[PDB]
Design a protein around this ligand. Structure first.
Ligand code: HAJ
Length: 207
């Protein structure tokens, strides 16, 4: 297990998301589905010039998996997936300029729901999750598990769980008072409201 410090700017973003009073938390789901859609567009596009990039799986989809026993909501996609370099360096680089833009917008009168427009919607997971684990596999790299409970650090390890083929699983370890996002009716409401035109099938698993 390797431990890394977030850049100060990303840490500050995560603290803002965790600390600001903001009742409209449900938007986290829209943001992670949008992230999945983006990742799926990428593999779909790349597969047009190189069909063998789909040898790791042809199905392009998003699954939403609630688990009351574990108190987790998992968003799974079969998108392009993330490399170790993404996890350690690249995502952070993109997040830095986005965080700065988002911060300035917020002071100008924007709200937290506009986070996605700045390319840092992933961190909205921390509206509802005390801990986020991300399992991811890109065609050019190994399966990795990224994990953070914020506090300024994240971990990366090689994953030895079930091999996933290709894509990303975002596992939300929900805060004690945010278990509404495990309820079938609540998840369906949120998807219908914010994600109804996503261009990939979204399957909400039942318990
Ligand atoms: N599902 C999914 N696939 C991608 C992704 C991807 F598949 C390729 C490149 C970048 C990506 N960025 C994100 C957003 C993201 C940002 C920061 C993160 C993260 C995911 O996981 C750990 O830190 N996602 N989310």
């Amino acid at each position: 297990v390797e431990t890394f410090a977030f850049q100060a700017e990303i840490a500050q973003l995560m603290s803002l998301i965790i600390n600001t009073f903001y009742s409209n938390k449900e938007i986290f789901l829209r943001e992670l589905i949008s992230n999945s859609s983006d990742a799926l567009d990428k593999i779909r596009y790349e597969s047009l010039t190189d069909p063998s990039k789909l040898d790791s799986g042809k199905e392009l989809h998003i699954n939403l998996i609630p688990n009351k026993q574990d108190r987790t909501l998992t968003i799974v996609d079969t998108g392009i997936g993330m490399t170790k370099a993404d996890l350690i360096n690249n995502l952070g680089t993109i997040a830095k300029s986005g965080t700065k833009a988002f911060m300035e917008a917020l002071q100008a009168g924007a709200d937290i729901s506009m986070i996605g427009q700045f390319g840092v919607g992933f961190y909205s997971a921390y509206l509802v999750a005390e801990k986020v684990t991300v399992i991811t596999k890109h065609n050019d790299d190994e399966q990795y598990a990224w994990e953070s409970s914020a506090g300024g650090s994240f971990t990366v390890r090689t994953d030895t769980g079930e091999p996933m083929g290709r894509g990303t699983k975002v596992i939300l370890h929900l805060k004690e008072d945010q278990t509404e996002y495990l309820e079938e009716r609540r998840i369906k409401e949120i998807v219908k409201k914010h994600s109804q035109f996503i261009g990939y099938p979204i399957t909400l698993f039942v318990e």
